[PDB]
Amino acid sequence: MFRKLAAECFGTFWLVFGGCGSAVLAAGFPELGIGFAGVALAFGLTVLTMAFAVGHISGGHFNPAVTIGLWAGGRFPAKEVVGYVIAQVVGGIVAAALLYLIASGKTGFDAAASGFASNGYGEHSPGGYSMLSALVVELVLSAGFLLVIHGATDKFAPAGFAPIAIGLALTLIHLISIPVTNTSVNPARSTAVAIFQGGWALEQLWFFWVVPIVGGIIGGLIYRTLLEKRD
Amino acid sequence: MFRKLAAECFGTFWLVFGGCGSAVLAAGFPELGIGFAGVALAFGLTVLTMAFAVGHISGGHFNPAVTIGLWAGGRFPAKEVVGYVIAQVVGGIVAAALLYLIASGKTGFDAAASGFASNGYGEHSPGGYSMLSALVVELVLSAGFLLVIHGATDKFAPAGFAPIAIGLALTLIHLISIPVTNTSVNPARSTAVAIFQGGWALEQLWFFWVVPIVGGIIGGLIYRTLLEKRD
Amino acid sequence: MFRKLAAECFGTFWLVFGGCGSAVLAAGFPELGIGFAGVALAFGLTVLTMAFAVGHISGGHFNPAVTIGLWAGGRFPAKEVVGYVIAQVVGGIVAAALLYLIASGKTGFDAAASGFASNGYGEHSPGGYSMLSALVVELVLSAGFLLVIHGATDKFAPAGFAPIAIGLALTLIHLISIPVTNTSVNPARSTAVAIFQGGWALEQLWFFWVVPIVGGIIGGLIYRTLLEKRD
Amino acid sequence: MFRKLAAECFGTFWLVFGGCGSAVLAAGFPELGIGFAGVALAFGLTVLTMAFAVGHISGGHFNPAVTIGLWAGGRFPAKEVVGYVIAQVVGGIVAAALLYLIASGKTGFDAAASGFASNGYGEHSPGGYSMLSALVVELVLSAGFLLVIHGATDKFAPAGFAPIAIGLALTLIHLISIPVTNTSVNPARSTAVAIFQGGWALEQLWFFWVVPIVGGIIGGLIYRTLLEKRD
Numbered sequence: 001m002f003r004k005l006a007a008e009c010f011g012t013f014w015l016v017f018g019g020c021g022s023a024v025l026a027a028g029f030p031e032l033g034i035g036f037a038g039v040a041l042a043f044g045l046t047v048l049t050m051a052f053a054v055g056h057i058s059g060g061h062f063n064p065a066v067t068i069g070l071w072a073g074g075r076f077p078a079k080e081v082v083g084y085v086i087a088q089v090v091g092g093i094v095a096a097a098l099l100y101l102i103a104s105g106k107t108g109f110d111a112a113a114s115g116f117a118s119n120g121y122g123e124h125s126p127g128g129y130s131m132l133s134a135l136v137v138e139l140v141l142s143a144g145f146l147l148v149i150h151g152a153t154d155k156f157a158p159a160g161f162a163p164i165a166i167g168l169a170l171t172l173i174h175l176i177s178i179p180v181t182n183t184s185v186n187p188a189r190s191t192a193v194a195i196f197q198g199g200w201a202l203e204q205l206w207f208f209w210v211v212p213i214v215g216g217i218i219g220g221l222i223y224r225t226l227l228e229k230r231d
Numbered sequence: 232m233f234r235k236l237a238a239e240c241f242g243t244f245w246l247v248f249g250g251c252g253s254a255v256l257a258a259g260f261p262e263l264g265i266g267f268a269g270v271a272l273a274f275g276l277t278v279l280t281m282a283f284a285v286g287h288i289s290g291g292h293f294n295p296a297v298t299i300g301l302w303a304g305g306r307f308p309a310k311e312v313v314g315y316v317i318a319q320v321v322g323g324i325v326a327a328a329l330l331y332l333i334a335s336g337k338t339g340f341d342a343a344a345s346g347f348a349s350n351g352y353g354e355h356s357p358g359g360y361s362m363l364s365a366l367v368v369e370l371v372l373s374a375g376f377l378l379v380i381h382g383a384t385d386k387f388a389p390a391g392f393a394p395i396a397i398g399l400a401l402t403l404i405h406l407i408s409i410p411v412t413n414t415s416v417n418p419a420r421s422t423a424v425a426i427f428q429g430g431w432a433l434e435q436l437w438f439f440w441v442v443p444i445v446g447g448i449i450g451g452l453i454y455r456t457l458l459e460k461r462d
Numbered sequence: 463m464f465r466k467l468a469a470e471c472f473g474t475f476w477l478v479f480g481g482c483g484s485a486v487l488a489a490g491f492p493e494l495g496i497g498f499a500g501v502a503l504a505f506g507l508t509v510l511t512m513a514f515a516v517g518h519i520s521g522g523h524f525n526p527a528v529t530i531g532l533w534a535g536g537r538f539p540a541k542e543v544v545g546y547v548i549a550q551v552v553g554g555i556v557a558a559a560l561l562y563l564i565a566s567g568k569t570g571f572d573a574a575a576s577g578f579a580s581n582g583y584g585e586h587s588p589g590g591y592s593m594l595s596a597l598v599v600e601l602v603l604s605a606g607f608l609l610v611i612h613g614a615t616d617k618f619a620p621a622g623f624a625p626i627a628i629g630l631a632l633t634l635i636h637l638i639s640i641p642v643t644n645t646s647v648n649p650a651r652s653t654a655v656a657i658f659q660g661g662w663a664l665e666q667l668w669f670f671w672v673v674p675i676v677g678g679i680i681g682g683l684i685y686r687t688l689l690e691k692r693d
Numbered sequence: 694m695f696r697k698l699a700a701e702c703f704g705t706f707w708l709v710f711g712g713c714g715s716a717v718l719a720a721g722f723p724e725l726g727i728g729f730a731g732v733a734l735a736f737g738l739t740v741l742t743m744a745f746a747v748g749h750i751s752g753g754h755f756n757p758a759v760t761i762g763l764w765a766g767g768r769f770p771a772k773e774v775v776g777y778v779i780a781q782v783v784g785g786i787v788a789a790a791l792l793y794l795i796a797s798g799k800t801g802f803d804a805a806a807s808g809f810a811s812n813g814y815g816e817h818s819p820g821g822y823s824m825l826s827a828l829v830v831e832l833v834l835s836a837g838f839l840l841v842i843h844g845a846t847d848k849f850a851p852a853g854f855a856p857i858a859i860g861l862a863l864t865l866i867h868l869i870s871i872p873v874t875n876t877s878v879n880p881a882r883s884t885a886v887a888i889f890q891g892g893w894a895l896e897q898l899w900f901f902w903v904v905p906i907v908g909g910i911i912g913g914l915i916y917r918t919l920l921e922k923r924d
């Protein structure tokens with residue numbers, strides 16, 4: 001365990017630093033900016049490169065909703081969960097700190113006013129979507145995410161392909177939901193960035209813990225008590 | 232069969248929710264929108280992530296044209312077809328419903344006036360292309376799609392790579408045909424979205440059932456009676 | 463041979479129809495257009511999906527420069543070359559014909575004036591680059607392309623990954639050279655489209671036969687008499 | 694060794710010619726330009742296609758920070774390092790020369806004034822970021838890069854997937870850091886292009902040798918003395 005947690009910490013740090021870093025540093029860059037499609041690719045790739053680099057160690061969760069989701073689907077032991085969830089929040093926060101430091105090297109930076117890539121709904125939704133819209137998309141996408149993780153980790157097809165299926169799945173998820181909640185489906189990622197925004201983000205933070213997790217559990221039971229295995 | 236259909240339902244739901252969701256939620260977002268290239272990537276990725284997650288269960292069709300296409304090429308039994316085709320239409324429609332619900336959380340939403348990512352030709356073609364143009368591209372692309380599916384499912388090269396070849400093939404198909412018909416090549420996907428547009432989409436719906444299917448059958452016989460196997 | 467040629471024909475048709483189709487149908491679409499990055503992805507993906515679908519049959523060349531390049535590197539028999547090169551030109555031309563038909567379904571279409579995705583230099587170069595610039599980039603990129611094909615087909619690492627390495631390599635090649643020559647590195651692709659442009663394209667056609675081929679041969683000998691094998 | 698160096702030379706040439714070529718030839722092309730997301734994809738793909746083509750020969754470094762990084766992590770012998778580092782700088786410079794020649798075929802070209810895709814900080818940073826910001830991102834990203842390389846080269850999961858994990862990792866790195874330093878994490882790449890810019894680039898060159906390397910060493914020891922192996 002004194003090695004599987006390091007991978008957890010270093011993985012969620014990569015995800016935050018990369019995904020959110022692309023969001024605050026290059027998403028809106030004038031003319032040459034990467035936009036949502038670029039940030040969506042980044043997030044997915046942080047997971048794909050780390051799932052290949054440290055997946056054969058901790059399993060490549062880098063997400064509390066994924067950990068607690070592998071538990072519900074009956075594939076990840078209990079109490080080890082807490083160890084992962086904490087390492088995930090820490091790694092994300094560290095990354096968010098260095099990110100904030102890097103972004104501060106440019107005149108006019110304002111993590112409060114800009115949002116600092118924080119997830120939010122209603123008045124804090126990128127496309128101005130209602131809290132209902134945020135709940136539905138976040139839940140469905142979260143459920144589907146874990147459903148793909150489970151099927152891809154199943155012992156009947158992948159065989160080294162899981163990193164690609166999971167990483168691209170996260171990319172797809174951002175191509176859909178960024179306009180709604182800016183896309184979370186990962187409590188560790190929402191917390192890491194809400195802390196530095198220190199305002200409204202920290203007030204809706206609770207939402208991106210429950211829905212992502214609930215949805216994640218739903219998807220774990222769906223594949224468990226409805227798909228494969230049987231015998 | 233009480234497990235292969237669930238995968239069919241959950242797969243076509245993923246495809247619709249994701250592909251069409253990106254189309255109605257983020258394709259045209261101001262400045263940071265993903266555009267056609269983004270929607271094209273999304274569609275392809277829904278198939279790729281689900282083909283890896285539930286392909287080793289149902290075969291990963293998520294498309295009536297693909298099912299009926301694997302039958303013509305002589306690789307998919309009869310009557311089981313009907314079971315798949317229905318599960319595919321249901322999953323798509325469910326997704327279209329939740330999508331409509333999510334999109335409704337934003338002021339000014341109008342599935343009738345916006346089209347709601349519906350396929351269409353002539354006056355309902357994105358680039359204003361004639362019905363002829365729609366027929367040709369939809370047929371050729373549909374035939375090629377199934378031709379790639381067959382070769383990638385062949386027992387002489389892939390070996391776990393089929394999900395990538397099929398998923399990217401669908402992405403490619405949207406990079407070409409969105410301006411023409413908004414890209415269908417999947418009856419289940421055209422129906423799911425035409426129902427909520429409830430106007431012209433439901434009037435041209437028939438077109439995106441026959442051509443996609445006919446073209447799909449053409450491609451299944453082309454690889455069967457012209458490529459590989461032999462012995 | 464009465465099966466390996468069909469794959470050749472159907473593959474180069476896919477490449478032209480898809481790569482050039484994205485170029486003339488969606489590259490410049492208003493606001494939502496895919497641009498060069500989109501066309502570059504399309505071209506690469508036509509090769510990747512067909513290399514997986516019909517590569518375990520003909521080897522997946524879909525390019526005269528690749529065929530004649532595998533011969534120089536000492537990996538592809540003679541005279542069979544002519545069989546491939548002809549099937550490649552035919553498949554490309556057929557696709558170019560259907561493409562022209564599809565593009566004609568939209569008011570204002572003009573293959574002569576628009577260029578119809580034709581390769582060219584000097585006054586017919588997208589970025590207005592000199593013939594020298596066209597020669598260098600086309601040669602280097604063509605040499606590198608075949609160098610990657612050879613190494614990826616080598617029996618010491620890939621093992622089913624060749625389609626990905628070759629397909630993405632072609633994508634990369636378009637991200638660099640479209641502004642220069644609109645990117646050719648494939649005689650079959652330049653001919654298929656120059657015929658319908660019927661003007662200047664048919665006058666510089668010769669250039670995109672020799673350089674692509676010469677460069678292709680250079681890369682085949684470089685990997686042969688400088689890399690791997692030895693024993 | 695008289696074969697592993699050729700791959701080193703030809704690989705770093707590919708990386709420079711492709712990555713930087715896309716940067717100077719098509720990144721800013723009017724309306725249809727590929728932007729940062731396009732250049733980021735190019736760089737990553739040069740590594741991915743060459744890692745598959747000549748990785749089973751030299752190991753696919755194409756980067757002095759990667760070579761010296763595999764040494765610190767205890768996976769790459771000494772003195773052979775110097776052989777690689779030199780072949781890498783040469784290949785990059787050759788490519789930079791041909792690139793400069795190609796770019797010269799277009800009226801108004803000015804490698805001094807345009808920067809010629811050179812890395813830089815402060816007043817020479819694309820987004821105008823402080824030297825501190827440049828140090829942090831370059832170090833972290835460099836450390837993470839080698840951390841992914843090590844885990845992906847580990848003998849417990851990849852098995853032919855390393856090229857994908859490493860190539861996409863470099864893409865991700867550019868989606869984040871281009872606005873800051875224009876992204877280096879590769880001394881050979883910074884030198885190849887600074888020589889032709891011949892001005893400020895050659896004055897900050899030292900920075901993109903030390904930080905990339907230091908960060909690279911940090912990541913090599915992190916995976917070595919903190920992750921996997923054990924027994």
Ligand SMILES: CCCCCCCCO[C@@H]1[C@@H](O)[C@H](O)[C@@H](CO)O[C@H]1O
Nearest residue numbers: 093094097111112195196197198199
């Ligand atoms: C490893 C480094 C961890 C450091 C954690 C730092 C947390 C700082 O958190 C504070 C917020 O709570 C505050 O409201 C905002 C805005 O003014 O400023 C941040 O820096």
Ligand SMILES: CCCCCCCCO[C@@H]1[C@@H](O)[C@H](O)[C@@H](CO)O[C@H]1O
Nearest residue numbers: 089191195198199200202203204205
């Ligand atoms: C891991 C860190 C746990 C985060 C929980 C933070 C709870 C604080 O929540 C409060 C909000 O309720 C308050 O209105 C805003 C206004 O600026 O200040 C926040 O810090």
Ligand SMILES: CCCCCCCCO[C@@H]1[C@@H](O)[C@H](O)[C@@H](CO)O[C@H]1O
Nearest residue numbers: 086089191202203204205206207209
């Ligand atoms: C492991 C760390 C767990 C962090 C969970 C943080 C949950 C957020 O908790 C905060 C509350 O404390 C705050 O007062 C309300 C106001 O509406 O906003 C919530 O989001």
Ligand SMILES: CCCCCCCCO[C@@H]1[C@@H](O)[C@H](O)[C@@H](CO)O[C@H]1O
Nearest residue numbers: 187203204205206207208209210213
């Ligand atoms: C570990 C994550 C659990 C988060 C604990 C959240 C405790 C507070 O939860 C309440 C919500 O239930 C309430 O409806 C909203 C606003 O209307 O205010 C929040 O603070």
Ligand SMILES: CCCCCCCCO[C@@H]1[C@@H](O)[C@H](O)[C@@H](CO)O[C@H]1O
Nearest residue numbers: 324325328342343426427428429430
């Ligand atoms: C599982 C949920 C399935 C629900 C299916 C709902 C189908 C509704 O279908 C109707 C259309 O027929 C109508 O014309 C349009 C526009 O006013 O409104 C839609 O909601």
Ligand SMILES: CCCCCCCCO[C@@H]1[C@@H](O)[C@H](O)[C@@H](CO)O[C@H]1O
Nearest residue numbers: 320422426429430431433434435436
């Ligand atoms: C699975 C659902 C089957 C869909 C078949 C729908 C057939 C209805 O088709 C009619 C059109 O012909 C009519 O002109 C339009 C105008 O608003 O109304 C539609 O509902």
Ligand SMILES: CCCCCCCCO[C@@H]1[C@@H](O)[C@H](O)[C@@H](CO)O[C@H]1O
Nearest residue numbers: 317320422433434435436437438440
């Ligand atoms: C399994 C469900 C099959 C759905 C097939 C729906 C076919 C569409 O059918 C409708 C007709 O009923 C309508 O009146 C005409 C008008 O031109 O438009 C067609 O598209």
Ligand SMILES: CCCCCCCCO[C@@H]1[C@@H](O)[C@H](O)[C@@H](CO)O[C@H]1O
Nearest residue numbers: 418434435436437438439440441444
């Ligand atoms: C299951 C899908 C089959 C669809 C059944 C379609 C039945 C109606 O089909 C007719 C077409 O043949 C006719 O030409 C067009 C418009 O000119 O009107 C349609 O409604």
Ligand SMILES: CCCCCCCCO[C@@H]1[C@@H](O)[C@H](O)[C@@H](CO)O[C@H]1O
Nearest residue numbers: 555556559573574657658659660661
């Ligand atoms: C299988 C179908 C193959 C058909 C080949 C058709 C070749 C036509 O080629 C002609 C050009 O030579 C002519 O100059 C241009 C512009 O006016 O018109 C084209 O259609």
Ligand SMILES: CCCCCCCCO[C@@H]1[C@@H](O)[C@H](O)[C@@H](CO)O[C@H]1O
Nearest residue numbers: 551653657660661662664665666667
């Ligand atoms: C496979 C088809 C072979 C193509 C070779 C074509 C050679 C014709 O080349 C001539 C040019 O030299 C002439 O100036 C232009 C002007 O419109 O007309 C072309 O058709």
Ligand SMILES: CCCCCCCCO[C@@H]1[C@@H](O)[C@H](O)[C@@H](CO)O[C@H]1O
Nearest residue numbers: 548551653664665666667668669671
């Ligand atoms: C298998 C088919 C081979 C096709 C090769 C076509 C080569 C092009 O050949 C044409 C010449 O015939 C024409 O007159 C000159 C004018 O400068 O332009 C060339 O490109």
Ligand SMILES: CCCCCCCCO[C@@H]1[C@@H](O)[C@H](O)[C@@H](CO)O[C@H]1O
Nearest residue numbers: 649665666667668669670671672675
């Ligand atoms: C099969 C492809 C071979 C192509 C045959 C080309 C024959 C003509 O080649 C000549 C070139 O050598 C000449 O320099 C240019 C223009 O300055 O005119 C061309 O037509």
Ligand SMILES: CCCCCCCCO[C@@H]1[C@@H](O)[C@H](O)[C@@H](CO)O[C@H]1O
Nearest residue numbers: 786787790804805888889890891892
């Ligand atoms: C294999 C080819 C290697 C050739 C190396 C050429 C190095 C040239 O380097 C010079 C710079 O030092 C000079 O300041 C700039 C700007 O005026 O011009 C460049 O060409």
Ligand SMILES: CCCCCCCCO[C@@H]1[C@@H](O)[C@H](O)[C@@H](CO)O[C@H]1O
Nearest residue numbers: 782884888891892893895896897898
């Ligand atoms: C492999 C090549 C090694 C590169 C090291 C170059 C060291 C030269 O460094 C000087 C700078 O210090 C000087 O101020 C600028 C101004 O134009 O000129 C440069 O050439």
Ligand SMILES: CCCCCCCCO[C@@H]1[C@@H](O)[C@H](O)[C@@H](CO)O[C@H]1O
Nearest residue numbers: 779782884895896897898899900902
């Ligand atoms: C193998 C080749 C190694 C190249 C290392 C080049 C290091 C750059 O070295 C130069 C110095 O020589 C110059 O005078 C200062 C000015 O501030 O700028 C540095 O970047």
Ligand SMILES: CCCCCCCCO[C@@H]1[C@@H](O)[C@H](O)[C@@H](CO)O[C@H]1O
Nearest residue numbers: 880896897898899900901902903906
């Ligand atoms: C091989 C790469 C090593 C590079 C050698 C660099 C030697 C010079 O290094 C100095 C830096 O230490 C100094 O702080 C900066 C500017 O303030 O000027 C540079 O030239």
